[PDB]
């Protein structure tokens, strides 16, 4: 009494990876045209994204496409005669390297930090000084083309997908998500590269929403996702001179020759009352996850200089913060928070960064990067958006310890395509009916399986149809023309409600029409008919088989 | 073939410093952790700590935290421990321990051979 | 803390019998336990890696299941090879042994 009803369009969709394409990289369109869904509810997993994955061999490989055609200091990585600077933190460096002429030389005299040195000998009068990693590896000078300032990247979809995002205000990342939109590109999401904490960054819409893989072990990273930014103006005040040479035929290095004036330390200004407030209730909202239990912020215990201070991108210098004023702080569960005193100050947390010139890019360790110095001071001010906690793990005294952490930069990208899932459309379905033969992307997806069935043109419509994306294009053709050769196979070309002569049989879903046309939607449906499509579909090849030999005997009577 | 190759047994007395180290062979040193266990004679297994030898980080148990330092050489792939103000009580076998994969480091697959310390006057 | 309770501290068995081993976390919501054998003179082995499944070079006679805060070990048939002392481990907290 019911037989198999082949329809192409269906909004129902799977999970799926797909090389999605910037776009600042391709011109961007007006709106990303989101289309929310009603009565939808999809399963994110923010720690098992592969957005992030993809986002970050971008960051990787852009960064890298950019040092390419540069200088490489391979003339520099000679021994040098450093004495301090008294005309350490800096050190006044001469050299004897190579001119543009090859058969001169040059001496030449540059102010480098101490930071940036390694010593040939016992340290003292100069001593001999080579400069960081340069007998490990090349390192690379910046050209004064590259820019330092984040650029908004959208990532839009290939066609055949679709990128679901999140609009529960008080998602942690994980877990079923209802109010479900869907996007074709992400909003502008700036690749910030920021130690301990996040710079420039999305706040919460309600509060602050800690978020991590597993709150139980010592190993995942704790984001905090703030709802209002703590302000961070951080300067370098010294009034730099800058002067270059050259070292090959149109290889021009620049370095710091002079400082006129005074020499004072790198800083950053964060005031007390917000910072302090700011963690007041981040204490709070980690006692909700904690109960009964000593929240306690602490400096980092250990690791490298990328993982123990600040790091951060000024301008172009690197700047590396001290951060243990800030992270100085017990709450315990009575509610007082114990650095009190701290909401009706006026004081300000001055934290001594130190700069860094020759920088271990990433940490692909056989690629360093030399940061051109700028002439005059610098001043940047940024936003806090967040926090990267590391808790202590351990036998307590029911105390914890978050400690900063950081260095991975997937989870600086974890924090702004938290909301953003990435499915690929499964156009192609089938469902029971009575029939024997003889508005915008997914709309339909919450609605149910009988006001879905007459927006298919529009679904259908939205398949379209360097290496990175020609090979999604070549994939989303194969895709298209695969289901078409099966709709064409079954008889149903050209046809996006096709009736077939293949009887339902009741193992496959003894529901009733009224139970599925009016009360099930598409994806409830895929998700009960799965492990009998295999079977379907090769019932449907048979019959049409056979229809094709009866119409070719019935075209050869007469 | 996963090795770790540490150090031999070593005596010191309270108060002293002892150093131990993990030499890491087999694999690429840099994308995994590695997992400092100390084995008390009969009092079972204390976890002590781990290091990531990517940027150096490191989590030190609450419990020891001012005394166990971890440090990484990635140019001869070989971890150390630092642990200071050594009592009596912290004599035990130190091993050095491996996940099986990145992704879930607490499945300690691959262990090198213990470093017997021994504290007494 | 995750104290884990295990079970019991002295298992007398001969050869053939079936081994049953308890480990008891004081905290779980997931399938997270690993059980380790460690001969004397040697350090652990590894062998269930997660709540169940079983770990490569190590023959079908061990098995465990478990679920939250109440995991156990078997093994269908104690082998002479099969004494050592069995720990159970959650993350970085360790149980306190049972000597088989």
């Known amino acids: 009494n019911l037989w198999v009803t082949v329809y192409y369009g269906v909004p129902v969709w799977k999970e799926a990876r797909t090389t999605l394409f910037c776009a600042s990289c391709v011109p961007t369109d007006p709106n990303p045209q989101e289309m929310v869904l009603g009565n939808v509810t999809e399963n994110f997993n923010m720690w098992k994204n592969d957005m992030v994955d993809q986002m970050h061999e971008d960051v990787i490989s852009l960064w890298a496409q950019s040092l390419k055609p540069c200088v490489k200091l391979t003339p520099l990585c000679v021994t040098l005669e450093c004495t301090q600077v008294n005309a350490d933190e800096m050190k006044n460096c001469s050299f004897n390297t190579t001119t543009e002429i090859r058969d001169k030389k040059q001496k030449a005299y540059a102010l480098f930090y101490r930071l940036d040195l390694v010593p040939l000998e016992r340290e003292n009068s100069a001593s001999k000084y080579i400069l960081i990693n340069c007998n490990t590896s090349a390192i690379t000078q910046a050209c004064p083309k590259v820019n330092f300032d984040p650029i908004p990247i959208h990532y839009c979809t290939p066609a055949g997908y679709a990128i679901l995002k999140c609009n529960n205000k008080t998602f942690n990342g994980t877990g079923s998500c209802n109010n479900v939109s869907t996007v074709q590109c992400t909003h502008g999401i700036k690749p910030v590269v920021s130690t301990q904490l996040l710079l420039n960054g999305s706040l919460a819409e309600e509060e602050i929403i800690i978020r991590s893989e597993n709150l139980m072990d010592n190993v995942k990273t704790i984001i905090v996702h703030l709802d209002q930014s703590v302000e961070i103006v951080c300067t370098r005040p010294n009034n730099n001179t800058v002067k270059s040479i050259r070292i090959g035929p149109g290889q021009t290095f620049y370095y710091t020759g002079d400082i006129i004036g005074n020499i004072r330390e790198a800083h950053c200004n964060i005031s007390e009352k917000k910072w302090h407030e700011m963690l007041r209730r981040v204490s709070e909202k980690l006692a909700e996850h904690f109960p009964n239990k000593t929240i306690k912020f602490t400096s980092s215990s250990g690791g490298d200089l990328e993982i123990t201070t600040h790091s951060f991108n000024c301008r172009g210098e690197f700047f590396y913060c001290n951060t243990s004023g800030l992270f100085n702080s017990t709450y315990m569960p009575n509610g007082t928070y114990m650095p009190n005193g701290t909401n009706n100050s006026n004081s300000t947390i001055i934290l001594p960064c130190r700069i860094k010139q020759i920088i271990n890019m990433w940490q692909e360790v056989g690629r360093a990067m030399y940061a051109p110095p700028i002439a005059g001071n610098i001043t940047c001010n940024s936003n806090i958006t967040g926090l990267l906690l590391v808790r202590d793990g351990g036998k307590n005294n029911n105390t914890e310890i978050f400690r900063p952490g950081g260095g991975d930069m997937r989870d600086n990208w974890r924090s702004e395509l938290y909301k953003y899932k990435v499915v690929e459309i499964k156009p192609l379905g089938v469902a029971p009916t009575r029939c024997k033969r003889r508005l915008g992307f997914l709309g339909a997806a919450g609605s149910t399986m009988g006001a879905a069935s007459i927006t298919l043109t529009v679904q259908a419509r939205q398949l379209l149809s360097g290496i990175k994306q020609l090979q999604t294009r070549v994939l989303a053709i194969e895709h298209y023309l695969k289901d078409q050769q099966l709709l064409g196979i079954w008889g149903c070309s050209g046809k996006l409600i096709c009736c077939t002569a293949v009887p339902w049989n009741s193992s496959w879903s003894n529901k009733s029409l009224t139970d599925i046309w009016d009360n099930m939607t598409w994806m409830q449906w895929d998700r009960e008919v799965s492990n009998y499509t295999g079977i379907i579909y090769r019932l449907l090849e048979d019959s049409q088989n056979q229809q094709e030999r009866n119409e070719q005997d019935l075209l050869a009577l007469d | 073939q996963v090795q770790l190759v540490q150090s031999g047994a070593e005596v010191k007395k309270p108060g002293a410093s002892v150093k131990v180290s993990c030499k890491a062979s087999?694999?690429?040193?840099?994308?995994?952790?590695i997992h400092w266990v100390r084995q008390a004679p009969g009092q079972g297994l204390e976890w002590m700590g781990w290091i990531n030898p990517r940027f150096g980080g490191v989590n030190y148990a609450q419990k020891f935290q001012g005394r166990v330092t971890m440090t990484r050489d990635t140019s001869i792939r070989t971890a150390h421990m630092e642990l200071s103000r050594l009592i009596s009580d912290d004599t035990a076998f130190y091993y050095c321990?491996?996940?099986?994969?990145?992704?879930?480091?607490?499945?300690?697959?691959?262990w090198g051979q213990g470093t017997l310390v021994t504290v007494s006057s | 803390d995750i104290q884990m309770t295990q079970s019991p501290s002295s298992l007398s068995a001969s050869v053939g019998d079936r081994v049953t081993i308890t480990c008891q976390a004081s905290?779980?919501?997931?399938?997270?336990l690993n059980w380790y054998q460690q001969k004397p003179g040697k350090a652990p082995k590894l062998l269930i890696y997660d709540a169940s499944n079983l770990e490569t070079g190590v023959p079908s006679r061990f098995s465990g299941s478990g679920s939250g805060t109440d995991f156990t070990f078997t093994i269908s048939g104690l082998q002479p090879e099969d004494i050592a002392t069995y720990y159970c481990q959650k993350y970085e907290f360790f149980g306190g042994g049972t000597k088989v």
């Open positions: 087999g694999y690429s040193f840099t994308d995994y952790y």
């Open positions: 321990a491996r996940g099986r994969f990145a992704d879930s480091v607490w499945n300690l697959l691959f």
């Open positions: 905290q779980g919501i997931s399938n997270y």
